[PDB]
């Protein structure tokens, strides 16, 4: 129940442990289904080759390591992304590395991708995968995030390392080039090293199985100058890129953020990203004329949220950070709230709402 979750669970669950303990602890609640909405038809969509039930999934680095997916499915997600994974095991930053923003409902991290690698998070995919399949074809897609090793040398290389083990096990991948907190990554956004890294991540997913041949996606940051977007959105469009995620977390400080930690290094989520990633979203909607699928994510927490993401552009979206002040209750919230602009707004499902503020 919201009230309680957002007024009592959660501020108790904060006040005794670091977040890092706390999201750690959360996994393992959700990974055995300790937790407690039916989807209306308004909020299927179609799209990157799937049926999703509702349009509302959990965003990356929650679960990084597949563990929670079923008890995540559970919470009422419309999907689920996991990772980021790097080819090999990796510990990650150095602690203390994620911080609350309580008064700005927002948090910053720089965790370096910890990861477990991709042979124990294919191991653990496989484990379920029949399951998955079903889960899949009734409207519950599941999508796997990659990313790169600190100290490889080769970038385009550990891509295609993730695309051949965990493609095959995913709906989508998604080529996670805007994690602030590897050094230079950011960079495999521009131009030419972005033409360059998708063409060979591309022809690693052609060279798979029919029925084991993900979507890829390339999932992008707040940050970018416009000659940046410009420039992605005529690879995408050169490639035949089949989507992208908007957005990664910001590296800028907005002016009014109250917080203590406000300047820890790090990417900041939650509240004050919210407009940066809708901006963002609107512009890369019209600089691809509408024709590549967009999931919207960043700040969002509740109905209006989501929906706003849904007219610029976006047409499905994801949240964490709200999860981590709301709970659980939050996702039904933003679904309940979703449906109900839609009917107020004259919409027939959420279909008719992707895009719609660039049709005024
Ligand atoms: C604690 C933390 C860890 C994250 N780790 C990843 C990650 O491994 N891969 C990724 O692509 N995005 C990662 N993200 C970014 C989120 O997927 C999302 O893009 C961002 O937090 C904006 O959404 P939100 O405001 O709803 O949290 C992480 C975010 C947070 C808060
Ligand atoms: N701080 C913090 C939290 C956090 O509190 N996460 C969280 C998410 C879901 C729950 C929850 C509560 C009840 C059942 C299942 C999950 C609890 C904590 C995080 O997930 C990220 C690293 C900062
Ligand atoms: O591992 C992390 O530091 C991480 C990766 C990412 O893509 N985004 C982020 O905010 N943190």
């Keep these: 129940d919201e009230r309680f979750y ?13 977040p890092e303990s706390a999201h750690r602890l959360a996994v393992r609640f959700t990974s055995l289904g300790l937790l407690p909405f039916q989807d209306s038809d308004m909020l299927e969509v179609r799209v990157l080759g799937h049926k999703f039930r509702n349009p509302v999934g959990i965003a990356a680095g929650f679960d990084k390591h597949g563990e929670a997916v079923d008890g995540l499915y559970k919470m009422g997600f419309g999907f689920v992304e996991i990772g980021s994974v ?32 991709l042979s124990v998070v294919e191991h653990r995919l496989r484990a379920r995968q029949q399951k998955q399949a079903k889960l899949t074809e009734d409207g519950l897609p599941l999508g ?11 970038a385009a290389e550990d891509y295609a390392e993730g695309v051949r083990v965990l493609g095959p096990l995913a709906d989508y991948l998604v080529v996670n080039v805007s994690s602030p907190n590897t050094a230079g990554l950011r960079s495999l956004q ?46 995408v469009k050169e490639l035949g890129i089949d989507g992208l995620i908007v957005t990664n977390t910001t590296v800028s400080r907005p002016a009014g953020l109250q917080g203590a930690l406000r300047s820890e290094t790090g ?13 963002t979203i609107r512009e890369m909607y019209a600089l691809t004329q509408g024709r590549v699928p967009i999931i919207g994510v960043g700040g969002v927490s509740s109905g209006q949220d989501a929906l706003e993401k849904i007219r610029a552009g976006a047409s499905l979206v994801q949240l964490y950070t ?14 309940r709230e979703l449906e109900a602009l839609l009917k107020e707004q004259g919409f027939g499902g959420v279909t008719d709402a992707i895009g719609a503020d660039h049709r005024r």
């Design 6 to 18: 957002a007024e009592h669970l959660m501020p108790t669950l904060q006040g005794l442990l670091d």
């Design 86 to 117: 790097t080819p090999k095991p990796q510990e990650g930053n150095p602690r203390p590395r994620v911080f609350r923003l309580p008064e700005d409902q927002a948090v910053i991290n720089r965790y370096g991708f910890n990861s477990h690698g």
């Design 144 to 154: 796997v995030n990659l990313g790169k090793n600190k100290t490889s040398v080769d």
């Design 190 to 235: 521009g131009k030419a090293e972005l033409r360059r890294l998708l063409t060979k991540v591309l022809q690693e997913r052609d060279g798979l199985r029919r029925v084991h041949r993900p979507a890829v996606l390339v999932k992008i940051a707040p940050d970018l100058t416009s000659q940046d977007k410009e420039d992605i959105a005529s690879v």
């Design 267 to 279: 990417g900041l989520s939650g509240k004050p990203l919210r407009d940066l990633s809708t901006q």
């Design 322 to 335: 709200a999860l981590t002040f709301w709970g659980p209750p939050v996702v039904g919230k933003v679904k």
